[PDB]
Amino acid sequence: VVKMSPLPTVENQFTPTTAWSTSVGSGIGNFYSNLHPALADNVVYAADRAGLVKALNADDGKEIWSVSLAEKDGWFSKEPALLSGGVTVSGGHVYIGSEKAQVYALNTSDGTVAWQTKVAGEALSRPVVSDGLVLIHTSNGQLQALNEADGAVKWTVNLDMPSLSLRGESAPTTAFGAAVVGGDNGRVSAVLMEQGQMIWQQRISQASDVDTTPVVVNGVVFALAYNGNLTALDLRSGQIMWKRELGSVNDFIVDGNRIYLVDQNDRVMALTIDGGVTLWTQSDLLHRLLTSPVLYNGNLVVGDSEGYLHWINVEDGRFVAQQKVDSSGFQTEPVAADGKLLIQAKDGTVYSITR
Numbered sequence: 001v002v003k004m005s006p007l008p009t010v011e012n013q014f015t016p017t018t019a020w021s022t023s024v025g026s027g028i029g030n031f032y033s034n035l036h037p038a039l040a041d042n043v044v045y046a047a048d049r050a051g052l053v054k055a056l057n058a059d060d061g062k063e064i065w066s067v068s069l070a071e072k073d074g075w076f077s078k079e080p081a082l083l084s085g086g087v088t089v090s091g092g093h094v095y096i097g098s099e100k101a102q103v104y105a106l107n108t109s110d111g112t113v114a115w116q117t118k119v120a121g122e123a124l125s126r127p128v129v130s131d132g133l134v135l136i137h138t139s140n141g142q143l144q145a146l147n148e149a150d151g152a153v154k155w156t157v158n159l160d161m162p163s164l165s166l167r168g169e170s171a172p173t174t175a176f177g178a179a180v181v182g183g184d185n186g187r188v189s190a191v192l193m194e195q196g197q198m199i200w201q202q203r204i205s206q207a208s209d210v211d212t213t214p215v216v217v218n219g220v221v222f223a224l225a226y227n228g229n230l231t232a233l234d235l236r237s238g239q240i241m242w243k244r245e246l247g248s249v250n251d252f253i254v255d256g257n258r259i260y261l262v263d264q265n266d267r268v269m270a271l272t273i274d275g276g277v278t279l280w281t282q283s284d285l286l287h288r289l290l291t292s293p294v295l296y297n298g299n300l301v302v303g304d305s306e307g308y309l310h311w312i313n314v315e316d317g318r319f320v321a322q323q324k325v326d327s328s329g330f331q332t333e334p335v336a337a338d339g340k341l342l343i344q345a346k347d348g349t350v351y352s353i354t355r
Contacts, residue, residue, distance in 0.1 A: 002265075003287060004287045004289075005266075005283075005285060005287055005288055007306070008284045008285070008310075008319055010319040010320075010321065012320075012321045012322065014321055015321070015323075016309065016321055016323045016354060016355055017323070017353070017354045018325060018353060019351075019353060020351070020352050021326075021349050021350065021351045021352075022054070022056055022062075022063070023348060023349055023350075024046045024047065024052060024054050024344070024348040025047075025048030025050055025051075025348050026048055026050055026347065027049070027328070027344065027345065027347045027348025027349070028048065028049045028331070028332070028346055028348070029049070031049060032209075033049060033084055033331070033332060034084060034124060034126065034332060034333075035047055035049065035084055035085070035086060035087070035096075035332055036086075036087065036126075036332040036333050036344055037335055037342050037343075037344050038088060038094070039335060039338055039340060039342060040090075040108070042057070042059065042338075043055050043056065043057065043058055043064060043108070044057075044058050044061070044350060045087050045089055045094050045108075046087060046344055046350045047083050047086065047087055047096055048348045049083055049084070050070060050081065050082075050083075051068055051069035051070035051080055051081030051082075051083055052066065052067075052069075053066065053067050053083075053096065053106060054066045055094075055108070055111060058338075058340060058352065061350070065110050067106065067112070067113075069083065069096075073100070081098050081104075082100050083097075083098050084097055084099050084122070084124045084125075085098075085123045085124050085126050085127060085136075085169075086127055088126050088127040088128065088129060088134075089108065090129035090148070091148055092108045092109070093105045093107065093114055093148060094107075094108055095129065095134055096127070097119070097122075097123025097125070097126075097136060098122075098123055099123075099124065100122075101118055101119050101120070101122055101123060101138070102116060102117070102118060102119070102123070103116070103117045103119050103123055103127065103136055103146060103151065104116050105134070105148075105151055114151075115150055115151035116151065117146055117151040117152070117153065119136050119138055119142075119144055119146075119153075120142040120144055121138030121139050121140025121141075121142055121162065122138060122139040122140070123136050124138075124139050124169065124170075125169045125170050125171040125172075125213070126171045128171055128172050128174065128179075129148065130174040130179070130193060131174075131193050132147065132148045132149070133145045133146065133147065133148065133154060134147075134148055134151075135172045135179055137170055137181055139162065139170075140161075140162040141158065141160045141183060141185070142158065142159065143156070143159060143179065143189075143191065144156045144157075145193070154195075155196035156196065157189075157196045157198065159183050159185070159187065159189055160183065160185040160187065161185075166210070166212075166226050167209045167210075168208075168209050168211050168212060168226070169211045169213055170184070170211070170212045173213065173214050173215060174193065174216075175216040176235075177192060177193055177194070178190050178191060178192055178199060179191050179192075180214045180216060180235075182204075182212030182213060182214050182223050182224070183226075184212070184226050186204055186205020186206070186207070186225055187202065187204070187205075188201070188202050188214060188223050188238065189201045189202075190235075199238075200237060200238035201238065202240065204225045204233075204243070205225045205229075208228070208248070208250070208264050209264070210224050210226055210227070210248075210250055211224060211250065211292065212224055212226060215252070215254050217254045217273075219234070220232050220233070220234070220235060220241065221233040221238075222252070222254055222259065224250075228246065228247065228249045228264060229243060229244065229245050229248075229249070230243070230246060230249050230252065230259070230271075230276060231243045242276070244275070244276040246263060247263070247264070248263050248264035248265075249262075249264075250262050250263060250292075251290075251291075251292035251293060252293075253292075253293055253295065255295055256273075257272065257273045257274070258270050258271065258272065258273055258279070258314070259271040259272075259273055259276055260293055260300055260314065261293075262290050262293055262302065265286055265287060266285050266288050267281055267282065267283045268283075268285065268290075268300070268302065268312060268317065269281045269282070269317075270314060280316055282312060282317035282318075282319075284319070285310060288304040288306065289304055289305035290302045291303040291304070291331060291332065291334055291343070292333040292334070293334075294333065294335070294336040295336060296334075296336045296353075296355070298314070299311045299314065300312040300313075300314055301336075302334070303325070303330030303334055303343055304329070305331070306327075307325050307326040307327050307328060307329045307330055308322060308325065308330075309322070309325055309343070309353065325343070326345035326349055326351065328345045328347035328349065329345060329346045330343060330344075330345055330346070331346050332344055341355070
């Protein structure tokens with residue numbers, strides 16, 4: 001039976017530290033969630049499941065504003081918002097989706113609610129903003145586009161039915177006028193941003209916690225099937241270029257001519273971008289329950305359920321550094337942007353990390 005690997009013994013090549021940390025409510029606790037922080041213009045925006053949202057100065061982590069989104073929703077005077085998908089920031093708005101099928105847009109200036117919209121299903125995946133439009137993929141197989149200005153639904157597209165409960169985020173992505181979205185039925189779809197016109201669909205499944213969010217790089221769509229297989233598709237046609245039948249893949253990123261991934265057992269691998277030949281596999285974190293990986297200052301970084309960050313050399317998969325950060329553990333994604341590394345612990349605490 002599976003068991004967590006021991007903490008690796010690492011001779012630190014450098015000594016990473018915590019720049020600052022700041023509480024954000026009660027976080028996500030032991031609930032599954034995709035909720036993570038956003039960074040824009042030297043401000044960190046982060047939230048908890050209950051409904052608290054904070055803006056923090058990115059240099060010291062001090063609160064700039066806060067807002068509680070919990071509202072009355074029945075007999076009792078207050079109920080949690082169940083914030084899930086997000087946080088996303090664009091154009092002076094902070095966007096967050098909820099398990100109660102609400103999407104909120106907050107002003108970056110002061111945290112006040114600009115608009116709130118009832119969407120077709122649970123909004124468990126991050127809002128994605130493109131061309132004055134907030135794309136929401138609901139857990140119900142719906143893709144909806146909301147106007148950035150007033151939150152009205154401009155168009156809705158049916159991807160397949162809601163009868164399954166796949167753990168794993170499924171955000172849309174956009175490329176050159178089109179949205180591309182994965183799913184639970186094993187199909188990837190491309191639709192035009194203009195009015196939701198379907199361009200193509202492709203099946204990548206046949207017949208666990210997989211992020212089915214597609215990644216488009218230089219005219220190629222990279223996508224995980226709900227069972228963890230990695231496939232590359234032609235962006236224009238949806239034609240399958242290759243498929244790599246790994247027993248499973250949970251999370252991946254694409255950089256240069258490589259794909260870096262974390263599988264269902266927490267092995268970390270580098271593959272070639274063209275056909276994903278396996279350059280190296282690092283298995284010393286087996287069953288430690290990793291986050292998605294990010295690249296930061298040229299290293300691959302992942303967090304684990306015990307609250308460590310692990311820094312990995314992309315050339316050979318070796319560890320170059322290890323740091324203990326937060327005892328409540330790490331489950332959502334680390335965020336690497338604007339020269340900073342941010343990550344939110346399960347109890348809600350947000351960290352900025354210094355290489």
